[PDB]
Amino acid sequence: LNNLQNIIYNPVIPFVGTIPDQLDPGTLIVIRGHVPSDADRFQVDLQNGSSMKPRADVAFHFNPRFKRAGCIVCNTLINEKWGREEITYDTPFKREKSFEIVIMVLKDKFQVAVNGKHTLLYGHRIGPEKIDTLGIYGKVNIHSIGFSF
């Protein structure tokens, strides 16, 4: 890390907020918090705007789910239609456990690590320059949101 500057502490979920700079290659988004014991799922959405009707495009939907053995669904929403799901079954998330999510923006893809260990990759389907909004929804508690540009 270093260069990480945390804004937003303990936001009310759902949280929707504008990202303070363009997500150029090398940028980090760092989200710390924990999963409550009654959690079915939560999501971190990198969005093109904050429109609700029509629902803003989600360039990167990062969606841990905890039913059964749990997983992480990643996907992209365009014109309120979901695309092809990229499912990661080796999920490090567990109910009643803390996490640090680090999303690293590369030229061709996102690289995501959780609690210091690599978790997944997701190739860009929308140009990252169109991402200006971070949403966090569902059953999750967030201590901090920060960025490293």
Ligand X SMILES: OC[C@H]1O[C@@H](O[C@H]2[C@H](O)[C@@H](O)[C@H](O)O[C@@H]2CO)[C@H](O)[C@@H](O)[C@H]1O
Residue 75 in the binding site for ligand X (CB under 6 A)? yes
Q: Which of 63, 64, 93, 145 binds ligand X (CB under 6 A)?
A: 63
**Binding of ligand X by 126 (CB under 6 A):** no
Task: Tell me the number of residues near ligand X by CB under 6 A.
Answer: 6
Angle at 32 between CA 31 and CA 33, to 5 degrees: 130
- Hey, how many other C-beta atoms are within 10 angstroms of the C-beta on 128? 19
Residue 11: phi and psi, rounded to 5, are -70, 150
Annotated binding site for a carbohydrate: 65, 75, 85
Q: Give the x-and-dash track for 12-51 against ligand X (CB under 6 A).
A: ----------------------------------------
Q: How far is the CB of 58 from ligand X (least distance, A)?
A: 9
Enumerate residues 6+ apart whose C-beta is below 8 A from 73: 61, 63, 65, 85, 86, 87
Q: Whose structure tokens read 């093109």?
A: 48
Contacting residues toward ligand X, per CB under 6 A: 61, 63, 73, 75, 82, 85
